[PDB]
């Protein structure tokens, strides 16, 4: 009641780096709960896109550097509740995940929350009154620098002036969940 659930994921790299999502993520990602999906891109094909549509009707997605679909936008700004949320894959920033670069983009887009991908390393942190999310790779695909990556994604629970961010990570045999909270100053 009042809350909105936003799935944040990306960098699946299916099928050229992974054949699928981990069995445990598949099993837990059920339909009829998520309201919006913000995808950082590199799902890579339509097969993954049609899968996301099974999870929620409203799917938003930006272009990753390996995406087959050239129709996805570079970036996207979307308003959910009281939050303006920016979305960009993140290969455009050099060096990858740089805080000065991400900061510049937040101010460029004018967003409360900035979601980006590309590093395959999950992030959630407040910096200078604004919030920054990287869901990581939901498939744990290798990046340009590394294999041995932890599969992960994020669910935001948005209500009023407050966003509760849950990070799901497959570590050993369990999906561990962490909860971080962010209030709009």
């Amino acid at each position: 009641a009042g809350h909105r659930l936003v799935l944040v994921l990306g960098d699946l790299h299916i099928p050229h780096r992974c054949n699928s999502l981990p069995a445990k993520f598949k099993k837990l990602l059920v339909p009829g709960k998520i309201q919006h999906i913000l995808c950082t891109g590199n799902l890579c094909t339509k097969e993954s896109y049609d899968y996301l549509k099974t999870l929620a009707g409203d799917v938003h997605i930006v272009r990753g550097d390996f995406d087959e679909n050239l129709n996805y936008p570079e970036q996207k700004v979307v308003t959910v509740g009281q939050f303006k949320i920016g979305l960009i894959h993140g290969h455009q920033v050099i060096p990858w995940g740089d805080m000065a670069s991400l900061a510049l983009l937040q101010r460029q887009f004018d967003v409360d929350i900035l979601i980006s991908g590309h590093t395959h390393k999950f992030e959630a942190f407040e910096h200078e009154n604004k919030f920054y999310i990287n869901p990581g790779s939901a498939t744990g695909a290798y990046n340009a620098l590394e294999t041995n990556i932890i599969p992960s994604f994020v669910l935001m629970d948005i209500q009023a002036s407050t966003v509760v961010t849950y990070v799901y990570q497959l570590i050993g045999d369990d999906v561990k969940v962490e909860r971080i909270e962010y209030k709009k100053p």
């Binding site: 659930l5 998520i34 909860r179």
Partner: protein, 196 residues
């Protein structure tokens, strides 16, 4: 049936009794709440702190039963009263059935039970609907109603955890404080209250 000289079982039974009286008496409910809260913040693994906290509520214990804090400091022989209150013959840590862990656990169960008595139907049903881990987290959500169950305030109370589901449910694994058996009995009480 046994032969134990210390007051371990006495305080356990006394707390049982004081709780029955408190079901009517509101002033006593609040006094007993404070007492139990003070026991729960204390580390049972630290025998000195635990003897001290039980010891400092002497006014409260004397009101119910003067025999709890009784020590017959006769002549110049035997132990001193100061020395008695810091010793095993007052309250012993290696008791086979009512050690300080067991009393700390018992006090946790009594604190939830104390606040359950006057709580509303929605609360009692939440106790019934939730599994043990969800239940522990639900008790934390109702603070101070069912006690101050939270990190810092109850010793051994764990950080809340979240189930890997969409969305996550809050859960708490503090079995060392509120055991699965305690929760089962808390549930039994909630049922009895709904049958009144």
């Amino acid at each position: 049936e046994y032969i134990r000289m210390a007051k371990n079982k006495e305080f356990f039974d006394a707390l049982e009794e004081i709780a029955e009286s408190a079901k009517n008496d509101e002033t006593l409910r609040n006094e007993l709440a404070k007492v139990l809260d003070d026991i729960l913040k204390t580390d049972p693994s630290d025998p000195e702190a635990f003897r001290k906290i039980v010891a400092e509520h002497q006014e409260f214990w004397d009101e119910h039963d003067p025999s709890l804090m009784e020590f017959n400091e006769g002549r110049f022989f035997g132990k001193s009263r100061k020395q008695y209150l810091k010793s095993d013959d007052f309250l012993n840590s290696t008791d086979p059935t009512y050690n300080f862990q067991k009393l700390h656990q018992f006090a946790a169960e009594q604190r939830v039970k104390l606040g359950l008595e006057k709580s509303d139907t929605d609360t009692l049903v939440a106790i019934l609907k939730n599994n043990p881990e969800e239940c522990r987290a639900y008790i934390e959500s109702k603070k101070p109603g069912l006690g101050n169950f939270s990190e810092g305030n109850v010793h051994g109370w764990l950080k809340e955890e979240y189930t890997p589901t969409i969305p996550p449910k809050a859960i708490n694994k503090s079995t060392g404080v509120l055991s699965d058996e305690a929760i089962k009995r808390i549930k039994e009480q909630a049922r009895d209250l709904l049958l009144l």
